[PDB]
Amino acid sequence: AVIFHEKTKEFHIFNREVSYLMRIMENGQLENLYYGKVIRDKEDFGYLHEEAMRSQMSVCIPEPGILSMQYTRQEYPVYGTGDYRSPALTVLQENGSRLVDFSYVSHEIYKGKKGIPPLPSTYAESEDEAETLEVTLHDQVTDTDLVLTYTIYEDYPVITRNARFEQKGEQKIVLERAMSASVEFLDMDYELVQLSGAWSRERYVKNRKLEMGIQSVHSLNGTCGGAEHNPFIALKRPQTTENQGEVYGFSLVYSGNFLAQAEVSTFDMTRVMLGINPEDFSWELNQGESFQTPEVVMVYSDRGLNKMSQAYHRLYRTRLMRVTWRDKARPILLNNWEATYFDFNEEKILKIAEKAKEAGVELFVLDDGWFGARNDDYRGLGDWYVNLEKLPDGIAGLSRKVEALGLKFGLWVELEMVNKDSDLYRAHPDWLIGAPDRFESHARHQHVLDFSRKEVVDYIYKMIAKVLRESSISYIKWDMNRYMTEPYSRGADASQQGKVMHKYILGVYDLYTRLTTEFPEILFESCASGGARFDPAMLYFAPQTWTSDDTDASERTKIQYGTSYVYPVVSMGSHVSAVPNHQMHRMTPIETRANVAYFGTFGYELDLNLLSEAELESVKKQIAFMKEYRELIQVDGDFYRLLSPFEGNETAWMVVAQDKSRAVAAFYQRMNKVNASWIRFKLQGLDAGTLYEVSCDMAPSASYDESLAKIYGIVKTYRAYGDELMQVGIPIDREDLNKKGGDFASLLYTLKKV
Amino acid sequence: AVIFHEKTKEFHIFNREVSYLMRIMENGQLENLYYGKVIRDKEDFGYLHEEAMRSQMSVCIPEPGILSMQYTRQEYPVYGTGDYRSPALTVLQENGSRLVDFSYVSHEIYKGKKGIPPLPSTYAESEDEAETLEVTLHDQVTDTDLVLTYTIYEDYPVITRNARFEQKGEQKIVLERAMSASVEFLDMDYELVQLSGAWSRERYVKNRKLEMGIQSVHSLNGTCGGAEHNPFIALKRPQTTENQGEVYGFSLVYSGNFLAQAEVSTFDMTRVMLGINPEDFSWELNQGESFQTPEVVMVYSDRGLNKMSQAYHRLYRTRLMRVTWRDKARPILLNNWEATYFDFNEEKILKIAEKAKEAGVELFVLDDGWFGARNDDYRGLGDWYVNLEKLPDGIAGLSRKVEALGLKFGLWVELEMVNKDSDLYRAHPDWLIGAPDRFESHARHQHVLDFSRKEVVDYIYKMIAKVLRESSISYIKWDMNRYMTEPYSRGADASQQGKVMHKYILGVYDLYTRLTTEFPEILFESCASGGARFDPAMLYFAPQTWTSDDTDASERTKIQYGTSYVYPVVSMGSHVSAVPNHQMHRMTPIETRANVAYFGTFGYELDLNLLSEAELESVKKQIAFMKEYRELIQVDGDFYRLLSPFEGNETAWMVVAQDKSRAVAAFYQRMNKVNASWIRFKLQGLDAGTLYEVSCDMAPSASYDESLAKIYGIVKTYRAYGDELMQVGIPIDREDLNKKGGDFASLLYTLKKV
Amino acid sequence: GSHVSAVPNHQMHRMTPIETRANVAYFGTFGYELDLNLLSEAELESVKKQIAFMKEYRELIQVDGDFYRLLSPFEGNETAWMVVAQDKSRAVAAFYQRMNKVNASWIRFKLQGLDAGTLYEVSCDMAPSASYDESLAKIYGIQVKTYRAYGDELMQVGIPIDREDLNKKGGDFASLLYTLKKV
Amino acid sequence: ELVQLSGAWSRERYVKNRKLEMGIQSVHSLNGTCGGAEHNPFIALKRPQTTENQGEVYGFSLVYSGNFLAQAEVSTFDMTRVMLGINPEDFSWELNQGESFQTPEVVMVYSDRGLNKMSQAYHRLYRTRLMRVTWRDKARPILLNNWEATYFDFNEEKILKIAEKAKEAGVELFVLDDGWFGARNDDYRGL
């Protein structure tokens, strides 16, 4: 709902769960009054705004009145007129001044949502789902206008904001900074929650306590958001638990350079902003030209972090992904990277795909080594045609044979980069990104292809569109392992640099749109070396991504616990792999790897013919279990986090159906403890007054000397109510998880209605 | 000492306390290797630079080598070549690109210190007292050169850093960000200390813990550094107290917009930068033009915060203040601001000064109201003649009469601001600092002038030297009560509009230089609304500063505790005010007011003829004590902080002579406790083995009631050793400070060698 | 059991406004350990007005009503509590300060124990004390509260506190008392 | 976390919180004639993240006005035991044939919505089920005391001028506080 209160000049936006208030000042500005849980509205709310007479305070209205921007909560601030806090807008004019002033003109209210066509966003399937308010402000000196757009979703506590700039005069202006949102609070008793990491260790949860000054996260990686920081921010009280408290969450729909900032002043006032990085941003606007900023999604919860995470999960599963895969279950596949990184051939492949049919696999994906002359990591990239010295029948023959075996087919592609020895560099090397007379840095023997121009991307498409047309492909994986250096473009005027780092992202979005439009029957897999581009803007284009290049049950729980704060379980991609690890070289039980891999998308990175017959029968049961339970696990259910691996030695989570009639729970341990305490296990989301039955499997696997447990002197179905399973819990015996391997151990429990 | 080690291309700078190591890498850049406590020197140190291969890492040298700027410690970095942290330099060129590469060319070593003429800086008397190193770097694409200057102070653990840019080509460049120093550390187990506050509460000490991301403090006030944050940053270990631990301190010699930033990466690498705020800064350089940045002074201590603060005190007293007031004791003065507001004649001024001559006062100061039509706060500012209605005798006659009475004379000026009702605005309104077709904000009914324009500085210099030449003045107080807003200059071009704030600061420096040079016998008092511009820069021209405008017996025990971290005691001003305060309206004993006002520059703001005879004796005793002990307190003496008011209820400091032969200590209490514990007072700076005698004065206050004490049944001197006073302490009786007033009580102790 | 004593109290030797002493003595058994032949004429009239309040509200304060603690004096500078009736139709709230703050932030006094959906009327009397310098405020430029609200808007959004009304109540140990009626 | 009330004369019952660790944490009384102003016979165990409005807490109180001991022991297997009772410092009770001994009562209250709910439960129980029926739900009168008005120095004519004055104000009860009995002019004789 949206109401105006024309006699008082206010705005109240609310649904069954949240409220947002604002009003128009006497100098034509919009200023915040309240943002939080829902309240009833009345005609006048004027007492919530108060004025004082401080010292060193400069007023922006004529002499009789008193009003300052340093002591007020305003939406979309600006610098240079009495507010000495970090601004959100910066416009440069022809006389050399940076001074702007936008005043209220008109407003408009309607039902539904728009598309912000250049960029992705969330959509609405009906006219009764969302409501939208647009406010127009005008700058008379430079003759420009600014539109602020707010959208409210019903059935969720979800608010989205964006801003658009229009230029109408004969003058030209320059934008040097343009944030998307700004939210202000009257106190500082909060804590900032963020997700930070690096390669092979991504998205670890970190907490900081707010203090006067500035705290921020940023990304200057150019070609992606980076594995260092993730564009997500949370503000929570210091006494907020997974199932009680009060928390605000802000997410940005963008996959480029970003800045997220929280500034606390010396009068206990907090300001939070999110947007594009102004490091190398300079957008020139001429007569009849427009600019649109990314979208910011904010969610408020008053019952812990689980509720906020569930709001994100449902919203991103239902109102962001395409309707083709909204209510579908992902297949089970097998990759050859770990088994065969580079040295392979059709024959060595027709024996791996042959063995992975009795187990139950349904997709086979090839990897690097099938194009130009790529035998090593220094040659052949950019030549997207079939190598005939490894696949004599070509890709068409191999795909035909694989489909004849009863499987499906998939390929690997990296349509953004080039090597020096390829034909693309010899034909015309002026399509690279760089500057004249400057050295050209090299990451992995490869350089970026300048998508800021339309001619290059076009060529790219054709060279690959054919590969899809001749053969019968059903799955593609797009890898990208390089950052952007020296952002200069050959095809641009001296007043066109500064747009390249945004035009590149726009071009990659255009390429995705073309490929998805032509082939709406192909599942896409995004990959930035394993989790450097997990931004939702990609989830809008590719339904699932590769979470991380770790594949260690010990380290993947740590990564997935952090990832699940904002991103749904379906998005995360997981695989089971060999035991002598390559990244950590640690060895784990085969049942632990399977247990960790269940909560996501199942898959294998193994050589199924090298395993022993006493484990090629565990792979057959794992696949059966996964294809029995994937319907509950992926598309229909709620995710609860129960124990934190960041504080303690154990991890535990569970997933529950929407009607509370079926659930599965998992409990993992890190290090073996000797002569320790009794351990319980309490569950969270169930129904008191129901009579679930609990089932577990305690099969003692290999690596158990029952002949030594004798010297030291050392039925699974029970039926209980939701009450007992919540307050009391499930007793865990430390002797049981010693037969499961001891060091890294896991347990799954399955609950049933009656 | 500076040594080269040509065979290995290194640089070792050391003295008896600290060491700094650096070297030239294989791409012509400077790399930091070690900074800290002194170590002996060998020929080779190259094994301290470690490099390893990682993923997503781009090298900047030819293919066979491995060198990434993300995982190396470098001085004065830059963005766009393989580094994804915050840069320290941004240059914009005519082709539109921002890409620079500076390579080492030559170096020079000499003895002494230069002057960096446009800005104030520390000097070295004679030579053999300091040593200087200059490194020259050149870029071939733009033909611009950079000079980095390092200076080591012998006898102190002090290192100073600065930089300079020179343009040698036929083109023009635009500097958009320029920092003075950049230091890197290999870990992040540190704590950040800062001084933050507001009006009437300045420089409160605040500690923060380092976390991945950015922690920064800035200032955007334009005309000053402001009361919100101070240009000083310290890094300390978490277990560091006043007398043990390790700490690094950084201070910036500049009185304008500043930025101090600490950036922690995901690999546990910390980077600290200080410099000018790049918010609205853009400097254009043509052929034969140079740019000079402010200076950074950095200090290391390994024995607690007291040693660091003492290093600052000694350096800023002996090498920054002018030689005229370097070894003198400040006079005792009487002010009249709080005695009368805007309401005085030639006659009331004589009576208030006649009485304060038998007490022992030696200087009299006249405040705002003597010039123009300054009958209220609305008008009269800008024209600087004598209001003949109020003073028919004039400033000259008043000064002669005061000198006849046996005192000296002082005046109050504000040479930066104007009123609309003054003659200066009616004559010509084009000298205000503002933009066309924009509303002009007003702070206290006043506006700022464009010091940037010299025609204005020339007009202001006259009409003021006339007053200082006609009469016999000996004291001037300069007050500033308006910040800079809408920074536009009518006397400029479309370019060079981003140089207004720096030029304004340079212009005020020039005016100070003129006034000081042409009147070398006048003491200047700098008061930017009561502690908004306090910094070494202002100390280069005005030897003392008005600390705050609160004048509370308490409150000032928390503003001076925080202030004493970096600035010497002789700088801070301290006066006595009326018993019912004008700011907090609380009542304090006079003895506490005197005992707080001692540790600064003693003064009075009372009306001495409205006090009682029991009070005119106390004032005489106070004056005698101060003029007996001011030589020890101000000129020669070390300041020790004993007990903190930010953690606890009591405050305590003391000052000791330089040969451990005399000392005075104080103890302050905030709240009164009933039925509490025994309290001991441990001193910290003395000489073990000496036999001081300790003396105190204990005379009950007039408010103490004795007939009530007998119902509830409820000068000193003794000899002790230094160690007994340092490990055991002085036992304070909790009924002793119940006779001092009870609520806000204080005690003084004097120690003697015999 | 709580009483009201003479201003320079015999235990701590501290001066406190009489209305703060009355406000702290209301939550308990009201009493007077005082002598009324020593009080001034402008202060004897202020004592008769406290007895009427206590005789009017003691039934709600003592025999029927829940006690909620809102702010903690062991964690900050201010104290705050309140008493609510059993059917949620009347309430009394009290706010106390320890030290005066200069140039400080805003205050939002958040209540508890009421019910959303009920329209309450809030009243307070911010009468100045006898130790107020008006001209001092004049030269600084800084020179019948009944209003209606809802139950949820009082617990989720606070009552705005104006720090200038805490400076004319004594300033150092100032206190405020609010009355809520279901009408 | 353990919550207790500790203080002294003129400063009683300040709230103090401790974090449990393997060992013993206790509070006792040894004054003999009373529980003393130092510690009060009340103990709370609360979760570390418990506010006045959310979280779970257990409160134990002991109905006894003499020596007491309240103890909480944590073993090396993360097991916590809480005990309350009489202090065994000088306690030694001899029982013969046909003799019995009785211990004081312990009241325990559990809440899961902060501390206000537990405190309210205690207030209601102590008001309705502990105090005598005659003064259970009445309003206490307004009294005037003269200890800090006269101390030991007063007479009959001194107090009848106080009582007359405190009748116009609205007081309804007067209390003498000391010195009334013979030989009472200081704190040395007459008791």
Burial A428-465 (b: 16+ CB within 10 A, else e): eeebbbbbeebeebbbbbbbbbbbbbeebbeebeeebe
DSSP SS3 for B52? coil
What are residue B684's phi and psi, to 5 degrees? -125, -40
Structure tokens at D15: 């709230």
CA nearest C66 in D: which residue? Answer: D120
Between CA C82 and CA C111 the distance in angstroms is: 8
Instruction: Tell whether A478 is in a known binding site.
Output: yes
Structure tokens at A686: 């169930």
| Residue D119 half-sphere exposure toward CB, CA atoms < 13 A | 11
As a dihedral over the C-alpha atoms of residue B116, residue B122, residue B125, residue B130, rounded to 10 degrees, the angle is -90
DSSP SS3 for A146? strand
Structure tokens at C149: 């609200």
The whole-angstrom distance between A315's CA and the closest CA on chain D is 29
Q: Do A677 and D51 touch (CB under 8 A)?
A: no
Structure tokens at D176: 């003498």
Between CA A511 and CA A516 the distance in angstroms is: 9
Between CA B69 and CA A486 the distance in angstroms is: 14
Residue B479 pairs in a beta bridge with: B527
DSSP SS3 for D176? coil
What are residue B639's phi and psi, to 5 degrees? -100, 125
Q: Do D10 and B675 touch (CB under 8 A)?
A: yes
Any catalytic annotation for residue B139?
no
Residue A502's closest CA among A749, A292, A234, A248?
A: A292
Strands B232-236 and B247-253: antiparallel
Between CA D54 and CA B152 the distance in angstroms is: 59
| Residue B24 half-sphere exposure toward CB, CA atoms < 13 A | 19
Structure tokens at A136: 């127009």
What are residue A670's phi and psi, to 5 degrees? -100, -55
Q: Which residues of A437-577 form beta strands (DSSP E)?
A: 446-448, 475-478, 523-526, 544-545
Where does residue A327 rank: exposed (0-12), middle (13-18), buried (19+ CB within 10 A)?
exposed
Whether D145 and chain A come into contact, CB under 8 Å, resolves to no
Q: Do B220 and A84 touch (CB under 8 A)?
A: yes
Residue D28 pairs in a beta bridge with: D69
Question: Within 10 Å of residue B26's Cβ, how many Cβ atoms?
Answer: 10
Burial B400-430 (b: 16+ CB within 10 A, else e): ebbeeeebbbbbbbbbbbbbbebebbeeeee
Residues in chain C, total: 183
User: In three state form, how does the secondary structure of C25-46 look?
Assistant: HCCCCCEECCCCCCCCHHHHHH
Q: Do the beta carbons of residue A539 and residue A257 sit within 8 Å?
A: no
What does this entry list as its resolution, in Å?
3.2
Where does residue C49 rank: exposed (0-12), middle (13-18), buried (19+ CB within 10 A)?
exposed
Q: Do the beta carbons of residue B626 and residue B602 sit within 8 Å?
A: yes
Radius of gyration of chain B (CA): 28
Q: Which residues of A are marked as active site?
A: 479, 549
Strands B295-301 and C119-123: unpaired
Q: Do C69 and D116 touch (CB under 8 A)?
A: yes
Between CA A280 and CA C129 the distance in angstroms is: 60
Whether A126 and chain D come into contact, CB under 8 Å, resolves to no
- Give the H or E element holding residue A737: helix A736-739
User: In three state form, how does the secondary structure of B465-530 look?
Assistant: HHHHHHCCCCEEEEECCCCCCCCCCCCCCCCCCCCHHHHHHHHHHHHHHHHHHHCCCCEEEEECCC
Q: Do A39 and C106 touch (CB under 8 A)?
A: no
Residue A176's closest CA among D98, B98, B403?
A: B98
Residues of chain D neighbouring B677 (CB-CB closer than 8 A): none
Q: Do C141 and A53 touch (CB under 8 A)?
A: yes
Alpha-helical segments (H) within B359-476: 394-405, 423-427, 454-461, 465-470
As a dihedral over the C-alpha atoms of residue B430, residue B432, residue B438, residue B441, rounded to 10 degrees, the angle is -150
Question: Which residues lie below 8 Å from residue B427, measured CB to CB, with a gap of 6+?
Answer: none
Sign of the CA dihedral A380, A385, A388, A394? positive
CA nearest B673 in D: which residue? Answer: D11
Between CA A698 and CA A718 the distance in angstroms is: 14
What are residue B162's phi and psi, to 5 degrees? -155, 170
Residue B234 pairs in a beta bridge with: B193, B249
Q: Do the beta carbons of residue A83 and residue A102 sit within 8 Å?
A: no
Between CA A593 and CA A741 the distance in angstroms is: 12
Whether D79 and chain A come into contact, CB under 8 Å, resolves to yes
Structure tokens at D83: 């005990």
Interface of A with C in 180-199 (CB under 8 A): 186
CA angle, A119 then A123 then A127, to 5°: 140
Question: Within 10 Å of residue A103's Cβ, how many Cβ atoms?
Answer: 13
Alpha-helical segments (H) within A28-109: none
Question: Which residues lie below 8 Å from residue B344, measured CB to CB, with a gap of 6+?
Answer: B336, B369, B390
Q: Do the beta carbons of residue D2 and residue D44 sit within 8 Å?
A: yes
Whether B368 and chain C come into contact, CB under 8 Å, resolves to no
Whether B738 and chain C come into contact, CB under 8 Å, resolves to yes
Question: Which residues lie below 8 Å from residue B705, measured CB to CB, with a gap of 6+?
Answer: C8, C13
- CA–chain centroid gap for B545, Å, is 9
| Residue labelled with tokens 């270990």 | B237
CA angle, B105 then B110 then B112, to 5°: 135
| Residue A625 half-sphere exposure toward CB, CA atoms < 13 A | 19
DSSP SS3 for B235? strand
Q: Do the beta carbons of residue B559 and residue B548 sit within 8 Å?
A: yes
Q: Do D151 and B711 touch (CB under 8 A)?
A: yes
Structure tokens at A56: 């060193």
Between CA C103 and CA C142 the distance in angstroms is: 11
Between CA B353 and CA B356 the distance in angstroms is: 5
- Give the H or E element holding residue A239: none
**DSSP character at residue A449:** B
What are residue A594's phi and psi, to 5 degrees? -65, -40
Q: Do the beta carbons of residue B440 and residue B446 sit within 8 Å?
A: no
Between CA B392 and CA A435 the distance in angstroms is: 74
Q: Do the beta carbons of residue A51 and residue A38 sit within 8 Å?
A: no
Residue B19 pairs in a beta bridge with: B14, B36
Between CA A193 and CA B618 the distance in angstroms is: 58
Between CA B572 and CA B566 the distance in angstroms is: 11
Between CA B723 and CA B428 the distance in angstroms is: 71
Q: Which residue among A244, A676, A678 places its CB closest to the CB of D54?
A: A244
Between CA A300 and CA A19 the distance in angstroms is: 10
Interface of A with D in 668-687 (CB under 8 A): 676-678
**DSSP character at residue A633:** I
Whether A241 and chain D come into contact, CB under 8 Å, resolves to yes
Q: Do the beta carbons of residue B698 and residue B716 sit within 8 Å?
A: yes
Between CA A417 and CA A478 the distance in angstroms is: 11
Between CA B192 and CA B212 the distance in angstroms is: 13
Residues of chain D neighbouring B714 (CB-CB closer than 8 A): none
Percentages of chain A per state (helix, strand, coil), in multiples of 5 = 20, 30, 55
Structure tokens at B660: 């451990």
| Residue labelled with tokens 């006034």 | B515
Where does residue A236 rank: exposed (0-12), middle (13-18), buried (19+ CB within 10 A)?
buried
Q: Do the beta carbons of residue B556 and residue B600 sit within 8 Å?
A: no
CA angle, A404 then A410 then A415, to 5°: 150
Between CA A687 and CA A726 the distance in angstroms is: 9
Whether B707 and chain D come into contact, CB under 8 Å, resolves to no
Percentages of chain C per state (helix, strand, coil), in multiples of 5 = 20, 25, 55
Q: Could you give the C-alpha distances from C156 to A19, B5, B392, B547, C113, in angstroms and in order?
A: 11, 69, 64, 42, 12
Residues of chain B neighbouring C105 (CB-CB closer than 8 A): none
Between CA B559 and CA A297 the distance in angstroms is: 43
- CA–chain centroid gap for A261, Å, is 19
Between CA B633 and CA B656 the distance in angstroms is: 8
Contacts 24+ apart (CB under 8 A), A394-397: A395/A370, A395/A467, A395/A470, A395/A471, A396/A470, A396/A471
Any catalytic annotation for residue B479?
yes
Residues of chain D neighbouring C58 (CB-CB closer than 8 A): 139-140
Instruction: Tell whether A401 is in a known binding site.
Output: no
Q: Do A486 and B439 touch (CB under 8 A)?
A: no
**DSSP character at residue B386:** B
Q: Which chains, if any, share at least 3 CB pairs under 8 A with chain B?
A: A, C, D
- CA–chain centroid gap for A735, Å, is 39
Count B/D contacts: CB-CB distance under 8 Å.
Answer: 7
| Residue labelled with tokens 């109102």 | A319
Residues of chain C neighbouring D14 (CB-CB closer than 8 A): 74
Q: Do C31 and D147 touch (CB under 8 A)?
A: no
Q: Do D142 and C62 touch (CB under 8 A)?
A: no
Interface of C with D in 7-66 (CB under 8 A): 10-11, 29-37, 44, 47-48, 51-52, 54-55, 58-59, 62-63, 66
The whole-angstrom distance between B59's CA and the closest CA on chain A is 6
Residues of chain D neighbouring A676 (CB-CB closer than 8 A): 77
Q: Do the beta carbons of residue A15 and residue A300 sit within 8 Å?
A: no
Residues of chain A neighbouring B99 (CB-CB closer than 8 A): 435, 438, 486, 488
What are residue B343's phi and psi, to 5 degrees? -125, 90
Residues of chain D neighbouring B675 (CB-CB closer than 8 A): 8-11
- Out of B450, B479, B535, B607, pick the active-site residue: B479
Q: Do the beta carbons of residue B299 and residue B246 sit within 8 Å?
A: no
Residue A12 pairs in a beta bridge with: A3, A21
Radius of gyration of chain A (CA): 28
- Give the H or E element holding residue A463: helix A454-470
Between CA B214 and CA A263 the distance in angstroms is: 11
Whether C87 and chain B come into contact, CB under 8 Å, resolves to no
Between CA B474 and CA B468 the distance in angstroms is: 9
Residue A231's closest CA among A206, A202, A260, A200?
A: A260
Where does residue B657 rank: exposed (0-12), middle (13-18), buried (19+ CB within 10 A)?
middle
Edge-first strand order for the sheet with A523-526 is: A544-545, A523-526, A475-478, A409-413, A363-365, A333-335, A603-604
CA nearest B744 in C: which residue? Answer: C14
Question: Within 10 Å of residue B294's Cβ, how many Cβ atoms?
Answer: 27
Residue C178's closest CA among C164, C151, C159?
A: C159
* Method in brief: cryo-EM
